[PDB]
């Protein structure tokens, strides 16, 4: 069974940038090599094919070379919409083997993120548990970190993120930190913070809101 | 209009069987190889078989081979994956994808649909408005979120008035703890927007045929 054995995984580029990834084939595949791009929540889309031929309606950023072994993808010009990842596979003997893909993320400029801290929903405490919400919007680079304070006190078990593929439209991430108490222990304690230390500014941004408001 | 749809995706036990199928239309089903591939939770494509127009020749992958049956029905222009044996190894996203005409090339994928294998149970979310804090905001616009929590399986789809407020929205990947994933969306819009005028997140469970929709209003007695 063939191994597509694709490099780079991971890819950071900016706009204007010329890339070019590298599919090896554990043997011969002749010519037949396709590549594929698959944006976030979207299916596949076939670019090139035969490893050199543009599909229908490819744009001429998207070329393809190789044979034998060796094949490359390029994209000569790298747009924002290029964002996504990009896998080969082999079509000469079945099984059809993918590559592992290449995740490409987009360089652009370092940006803060707006935070917004949420008490627990109105709906939420009669159950006996109570999420305490803060959303990190539209920040850059990807890597960030936040501080739960109750009533001066960091608080790390509870603690749950979750960040968003970057966006196609403004290539920012977004994150959400969920901090997860009982009703009972988020009425015994009054102030409640999140903070953001992101490496735009020496100075955290910190959200904050008492129970009793 | 070159179109895939996938169904019979959702949640089965493990050594348990699940059948997929992928209508196609928009082009002749008869005249193309057909072939199904699938997408594990943070993993690659993995291709899982092909079969060409007649039904004469079809190929697995080696380990998919003795548990996976992939067969078509030219009459009903749709194409079937018949999933046995199936472990943890076969959650993921499944794709019917059209071979293009003269090369062994995906021409054509669906939009996927989604199979989990678990012991756990089914379990809906409940869902909850985040409105923010108690001061009335200053500023020219306002966040609003929408918590998940506490559903099994994956998928939720998640909309805001009922999909005509798109711009401004993130929503979060879903995380799993203890058999029970958490998810949450915000929305910003212009606070001459809200609350003003009424902002509504509507979430839906398939697989527990769950349709919940929360307004948002402003925090405080009414
Ligand atoms: C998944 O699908 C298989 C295959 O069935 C065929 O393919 C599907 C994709 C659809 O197009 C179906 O409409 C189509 O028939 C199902 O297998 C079928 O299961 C039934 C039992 O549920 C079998 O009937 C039995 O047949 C034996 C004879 O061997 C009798 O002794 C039994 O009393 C009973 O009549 C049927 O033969 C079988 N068909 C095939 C081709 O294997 C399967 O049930 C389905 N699985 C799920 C989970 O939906």
Redesign the pocket.
């Given at each position: 069974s063939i191994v597509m054995t694709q490099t780079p995984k991971f890819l950071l580029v900016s706009a204007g940038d010329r890339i070019t990834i590298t599919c090896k084939a554990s043997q011969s595949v002749r010519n037949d090599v396709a590549w594929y791009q698959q944006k976030p929540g979207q299916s596949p889309k076939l670019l090139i094919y035969f490893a050199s031929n543009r599909y229908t309606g490819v744009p001429d950023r998207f070329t393809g070379s190789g044979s034998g072994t060796d094949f490359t993808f390029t994209i000569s010009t790298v747009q924002a919409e290029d964002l996504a990842v990009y896998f080969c596979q082999q079509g000469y003997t079945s099984p059809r083997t993918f590559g592992g893909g290449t995740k490409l993320e987009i360089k652009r400029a370092d940006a803060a993120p707006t935070v917004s801290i949420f008490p627990p929903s109105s709906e939420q405490l009669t159950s006996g548990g109570a999420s305490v919400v803060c959303f990190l919007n539209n920040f850059y680079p990807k890597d960030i970190n936040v501080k739960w304070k109750i009533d001066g006190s960091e608080r790390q078990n509870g603690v749950l993120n979750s960040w968003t593929d970057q966006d196609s439209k403004d290539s920012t991430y977004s994150m959400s930190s969920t901090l997860t108490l009982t009703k009972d222990e988020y009425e015994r304690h009054n102030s409640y913070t999140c903070e953001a230390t992101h490496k735009t500014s020496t100075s955290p941004i910190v959200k904050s809101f008492n129970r009793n408001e | 209009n070159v179109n895939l749809l996938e169904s019979?995706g959702g949640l089965?036990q493990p050594g348990?069987?699940?059948?997929l199928?992928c209508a196609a239309s928009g082009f002749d089903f008869s005249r193309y190889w057909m072939s199904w591939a699938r997408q594990a939770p943070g993993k690659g494509q993995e291709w899982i078989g092909e079969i060409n127009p007649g039904s004469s020749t079809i190929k697995y992958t080696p380990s998919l081979k003795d548990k996976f049956?992939i067969?078509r029905?030219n009459a009903?222009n749709?194409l079937?994956?018949?999933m046995?044996k199936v472990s943890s190894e076969d959650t993921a996203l499944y794709y019917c994808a059209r071979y293009g005409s003269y090369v062994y090339a995906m021409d054509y994928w669906g939009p996927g649909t989604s199979v989990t294998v678990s012991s756990a149970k089914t379990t809906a979310p409940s869902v909850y408005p985040l409105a923010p804090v108690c001061g009335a905001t200053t500023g020219s616009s306002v966040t609003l979120g929408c918590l998940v929590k506490g559903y099994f399986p994956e998928p939720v789809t998640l909309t805001w008035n009922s999909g005509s407020l798109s711009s401004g929205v993130h929503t979060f990947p879903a995380v799993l703890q203890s058999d029970l994933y958490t998810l949450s969306s915000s929305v910003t819009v212009t606070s001459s927007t809200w609350p003003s005028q009424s902002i509504t997140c509507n979430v839906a469970h398939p697989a527990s045929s769950t349709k919940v929709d929360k307004k948002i209003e402003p925090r405080g007695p009414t």
């Amino acid at each position: 069974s063939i191994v597509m054995t694709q490099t780079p995984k991971f890819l950071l580029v900016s706009a204007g940038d010329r890339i070019t990834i590298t599919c090896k084939a554990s043997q011969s595949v002749r010519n037949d090599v396709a590549w594929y791009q698959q944006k976030p929540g979207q299916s596949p889309k076939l670019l090139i094919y035969f490893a050199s031929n543009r599909y229908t309606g490819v744009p001429d950023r998207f070329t393809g070379s190789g044979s034998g072994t060796d094949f490359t993808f390029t994209i000569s010009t790298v747009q924002a919409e290029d964002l996504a990842v990009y896998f080969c596979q082999q079509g000469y003997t079945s099984p059809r083997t993918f590559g592992g893909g290449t995740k490409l993320e987009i360089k652009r400029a370092d940006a803060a993120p707006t935070v917004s801290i949420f008490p627990p929903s109105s709906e939420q405490l009669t159950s006996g548990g109570a999420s305490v919400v803060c959303f990190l919007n539209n920040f850059y680079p990807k890597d960030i970190n936040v501080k739960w304070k109750i009533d001066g006190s960091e608080r790390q078990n509870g603690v749950l993120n979750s960040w968003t593929d970057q966006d196609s439209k403004d290539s920012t991430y977004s994150m959400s930190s969920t901090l997860t108490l009982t009703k009972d222990e988020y009425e015994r304690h009054n102030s409640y913070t999140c903070e953001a230390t992101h490496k735009t500014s020496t100075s955290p941004i910190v959200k904050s809101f008492n129970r009793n408001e | 209009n070159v179109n895939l749809l996938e169904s019979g995706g959702g949640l089965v036990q493990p050594g348990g069987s699940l059948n997929l199928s992928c209508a196609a239309s928009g082009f002749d089903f008869s005249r193309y190889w057909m072939s199904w591939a699938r997408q594990a939770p943070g993993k690659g494509q993995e291709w899982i078989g092909e079969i060409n127009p007649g039904s004469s020749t079809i190929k697995y992958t080696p380990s998919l081979k003795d548990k996976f049956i992939i067969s078509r029905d030219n009459a009903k222009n749709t194409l079937y994956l018949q999933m046995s044996k199936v472990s943890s190894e076969d959650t993921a996203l499944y794709y019917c994808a059209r071979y293009g005409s003269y090369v062994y090339a995906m021409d054509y994928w669906g939009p996927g649909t989604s199979v989990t294998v678990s012991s756990a149970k089914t379990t809906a979310p409940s869902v909850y408005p985040l409105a923010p804090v108690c001061g009335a905001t200053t500023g020219s616009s306002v966040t609003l979120g929408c918590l998940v929590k506490g559903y099994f399986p994956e998928p939720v789809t998640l909309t805001w008035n009922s999909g005509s407020l798109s711009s401004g929205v993130h929503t979060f990947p879903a995380v799993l703890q203890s058999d029970l994933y958490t998810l949450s969306s915000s929305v910003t819009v212009t606070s001459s927007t809200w609350p003003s005028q009424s902002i509504t997140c509507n979430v839906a469970h398939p697989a527990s045929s769950t349709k919940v929709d929360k307004k948002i209003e402003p925090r405080g007695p009414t």
